[PDB]
Amino acid sequence: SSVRPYLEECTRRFQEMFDRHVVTRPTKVELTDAELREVIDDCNAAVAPLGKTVSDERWISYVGVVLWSQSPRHIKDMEAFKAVCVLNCVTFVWDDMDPALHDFGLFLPQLRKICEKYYGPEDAEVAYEAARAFVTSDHMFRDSPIKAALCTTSPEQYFRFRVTDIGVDFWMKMSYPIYRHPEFTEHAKTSLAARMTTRGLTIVNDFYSYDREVSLGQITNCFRLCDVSDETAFKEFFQARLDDMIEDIECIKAFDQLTQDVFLDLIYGNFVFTTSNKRYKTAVNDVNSRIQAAAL
Amino acid sequence: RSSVRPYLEECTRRFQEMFDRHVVTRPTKVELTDAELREVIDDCNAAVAPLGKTVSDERWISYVGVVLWSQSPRHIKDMEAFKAVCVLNCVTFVWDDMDPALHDFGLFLPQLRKICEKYYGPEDAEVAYEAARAFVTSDHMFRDSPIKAALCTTSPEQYFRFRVTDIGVDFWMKMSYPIYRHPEFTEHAKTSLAARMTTRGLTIVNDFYSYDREVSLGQITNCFRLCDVSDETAFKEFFQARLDDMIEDIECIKAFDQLTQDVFLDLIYGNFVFTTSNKRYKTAVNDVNSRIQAAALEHHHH
Ligand SMILES: [Cl-]
Ligand SMILES: [Cl-]
Ligand SMILES: [Mg+2]
Ligand SMILES: [Mg+2]
Ligand SMILES: [Mg+2]
Ligand SMILES: [Mg+2]
Ligand SMILES: [Mg+2]
Ligand SMILES: [Mg+2]
Numbered sequence: 019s020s021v022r023p024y025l026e027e028c029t030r031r032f033q034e035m036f037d038r039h040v041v042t043r044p045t046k047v048e049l050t051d052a053e054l055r056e057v058i059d060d061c062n063a064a065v066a067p068l069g070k071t072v073s074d075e076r077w078i079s080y081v082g083v084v085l086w087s088q089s090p091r092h093i094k095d096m097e098a099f100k101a102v103c104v105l106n107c108v109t110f111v112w113d114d115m116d117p118a119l120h121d122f123g124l125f126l127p128q129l130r131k132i133c134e135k136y137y138g139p140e141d142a143e144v145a146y147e148a149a150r151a152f153v154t155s156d157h158m159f160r161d162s163p164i165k166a167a168l169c170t171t172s173p174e175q176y177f178r179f180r181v182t183d184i185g186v187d188f189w190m191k192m193s194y195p196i197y198r199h200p201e202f203t204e205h206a207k208t209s210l211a212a213r214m215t216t217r218g219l220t221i222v223n224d225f226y227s228y229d230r231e232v233s234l235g236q237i238t239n240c241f242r243l244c245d246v247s248d249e250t251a252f253k254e255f256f257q258a259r260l261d262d263m264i265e266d267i268e269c270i271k272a273f274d275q276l277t278q279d280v281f282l283d284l285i286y287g288n289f290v291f292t293t294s295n296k297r298y299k300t301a302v303n304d305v306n307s308r309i310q311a312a313a314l
Numbered sequence: 315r316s317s318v319r320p321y322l323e324e325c326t327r328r329f330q331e332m333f334d335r336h337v338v339t340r341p342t343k344v345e346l347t348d349a350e351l352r353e354v355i356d357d358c359n360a361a362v363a364p365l366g367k368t369v370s371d372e373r374w375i376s377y378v379g380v381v382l383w384s385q386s387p388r389h390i391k392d393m394e395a396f397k398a399v400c401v402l403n404c405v406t407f408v409w410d411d412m413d414p415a416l417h418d419f420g421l422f423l424p425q426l427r428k429i430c431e432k433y434y435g436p437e438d439a440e441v442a443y444e445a446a447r448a449f450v451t452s453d454h455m456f457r458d459s460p461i462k463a464a465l466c467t468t469s470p471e472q473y474f475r476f477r478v479t480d481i482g483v484d485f486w487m488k489m490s491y492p493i494y495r496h497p498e499f500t501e502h503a504k505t506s507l508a509a510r511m512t513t514r515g516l517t518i519v520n521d522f523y524s525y526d527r528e529v530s531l532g533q534i535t536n537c538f539r540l541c542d543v544s545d546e547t548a549f550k551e552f553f554q555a556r557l558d559d560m561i562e563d564i565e566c567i568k569a570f571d572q573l574t575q576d577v578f579l580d581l582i583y584g585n586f587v588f589t590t591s592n593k594r595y596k597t598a599v600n601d602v603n604s605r606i607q608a609a610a611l612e613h614h615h616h
Contacts, residue, residue, distance in 0.1 A: 182507060
C-alpha cells in the first residue's frame with residue numbers, strides 16, 4: 019500500500035499541531051562554500067573504502083536535516099556542528115546500503131577519524147561510541163526476529179526500538195558539544211534527550227517514508243501497525259500518534275529553556291526537512307535509492 | 315499517608331502467577347564465599363567513607379541482595395565483574411537513600427572510578443564508570459526537579475521513560491555485560507535496548523513494594539501515584555494494565571537470543587524475589603532503608 023491519499027490532510031494536521039504547540043519555526047543553517055566542501059570532502063573520504071560513490075547532490079540532501087534541525091540561537095562550536103553534518107550524512111549512506119557492503123573494519127576507522135578531527139578527546143569518544151552503536155544496530159537488525167517482534171507488537175515496543183534505530187540517541191550524543199550547555203549534555207548522555215524526542219521524529223519520518231520502505235520490504239514503520247487501507251482505522255491511528263507527539267512536546271516544555279529549544283527545533287526542523295527535501299517526495303530517486311552491492 | 319498495604323497479598327500472588335505462566339524458569343541466588351562478601355563490603359565502606367556516614371553490615375547485605383538474586387548464574391563467566399556490580403550497586407543505593415546535602419561529587423566520583431579500575435579492563439571500566447556517573451548525577455539532578463514532576467505525573471509512558479535511567483537499569487546493563495562476555499548482550503547493553511526492554515518489569519514490581527516508604531518520604535517517583543490507590547476499582551484496573559505491560563515486554567524479550575533473554579528474565583524475576591523477601595521492602599521505615607540524613611548541627615562543637 020501507500021499513504022499518498024492522506025498526504026495532504028496529514029501534512030496540514032501536522033503543521034496545525036506544530037503551529038499550536040511549538041509555534042516558533044525552525045531556521046536553516048547556511049554553510050559557507052568552504053564549510054560545505056569541507057563537509058563533502060570529509061564525507062566522500064569516509065565512505066570511499068566502501069567502494070561506492072555519492073554525488074554532491076545526495077550529500078546535500080542528507081545534510082539538509084542537520085541544517086534544519088539544530089538550534090542556531092544557541093550554537094557555540096561550529097567544528098562540532100560540522101562533525102554532525104559529516105557523521106549524519108555518512109551514516110545515512112550506511113542506512114541505505116545493502117548489508118553486503120557493510121565493512122566494519124574499513125568504516126569504523128573513518129568514523130573515528132571524523133570524531134578526532136572535530137571534537138576534543140572526551141567528546142570524540144562519546145560521539146564515536148554512539149556512531150559505532152548506531153551502524154552496528156542498523157547492521158545487526160537487518161532481518162532480525164527481534165526487529166520483527168518489536169515492530170509488529172505495539173507502538174510501545176516499536177518506538178522503544180526506534181530510540182536507537184532512527185539514530186536520535188546518536189544525534190544527541192554527537193550534538194551536545196555544539197551547545198556546551200551542561201543540562202543538555204547530561205540529558206544527551208543519559209539518553210533522556212533521545213527518549214523525549216523519539217516519537218516526534220519517528221512518527222513524522224514514518225508517515226513520509228512509508229512508501230519507500232514498504233516498497234523495499236522494510237518493516238520499521240509504525241503505520242504498518244494499522245490498515246492504511248481502512249480510512250477509519252488510519253484516522254484513529256493517526257490521531258493517537260498526533261496525541262503522542264503533543265504529550266511529548268508538552269512534557270518537553272518542563273525542561274530548561276535552552277534544552278527545550280534544542281528538542282523542539284529538532285522535532286520541528288525534521289518535519290520541515292522531511293516535507294521539503296527530495297529524499298521523501300518519491301519512493302526511489304537519485305538521493306534515496308538503495309545502494310546495491312552489484313554482485314560480480 | 316497513602317498505602318498499598320490492603321493489596322499486598324493478592325498483588326504478590328498475581329505477580330507470582332504471571333511469572334509462573336510467562337517466565338517459568340526461577341531465579342537462583344548467587345552464593346558468595348565469606349571472602350568474596352568481605353571484599354565487597356570492605357570496598358563499599360571505603361567508597362562511601364569520604365561522605366561521613368556509616369553503613370552497617372546488615373544494610374550492605376540488604377542492598378547487595380538484588381545483585382545476588384537478579385544476575386544470571388547459568389551464564390556468569392567473570393566473577394571480578396560480578397563483584398564490581400555488587401559494589402557499584404550497593405554504594406549507589408546509599409546515594410539513592412541519602413539527603414542530597416550529603417552528595418559530594420568531588421569526593422565520590424573518584425571512588426567510583428577506583429572501583430571500576432579495580433575490577434574491569436580499561437574499556438569496560440570507562441563504560442561502567444560513565445554509567446555510574448550518569449546515574450548518581452541523574453538521581454541528584456532530579457531531586458525536586460520540575461522535569462521529574464512532569465514525567466512522573468503525566469502518563470505511564472512519560473514515567474517509564476524517566477525510569478530507564480532513574481531506576482538504574484541502564485547503569486546495571488552497562489556494568490553487567492562484562493560478567494557474561496556475550497557479544498549480543500554487550501551490544502544491547504550499549505544501545506540501552508537491554509534497559510528499555512526490562513524497565514517496566516523492574517519498575518512496576520519495585521513501585522508496588524516501595525510505594526508506602528516513598529509516599530511517606532515525599533518521593534514522587536512511583537507509577538502507583540498515577541492512580542487513586544484507595545479506590546479499589548481504579549487500583550485494580552491500573553494494576554492490571556501494569557501486568558499487561560510486563561507480559562507484553564516478557565513476550566518480546568523471548569525474541570532475543572537465548573542467552574540474552576535468560577539474562578533479561580532472570581533480572582526481572584530475580585528482582586521480584588529479592589523485593590518480596592528483603593527487609594528493605596518489609597516496612598516503610600527501618601534501619602536498612604531509612605533516609606540517610608545530614609545533621610543541621612553536623613558542624614557543632616559538642
Ligand atoms: Cl527495516
Ligand atoms: Cl523521588
Ligand atoms: Mg534505518
Ligand atoms: Mg532508512
Ligand atoms: Mg523512514
Ligand atoms: Mg529509592
Ligand atoms: Mg531512586
Ligand atoms: Mg522504589
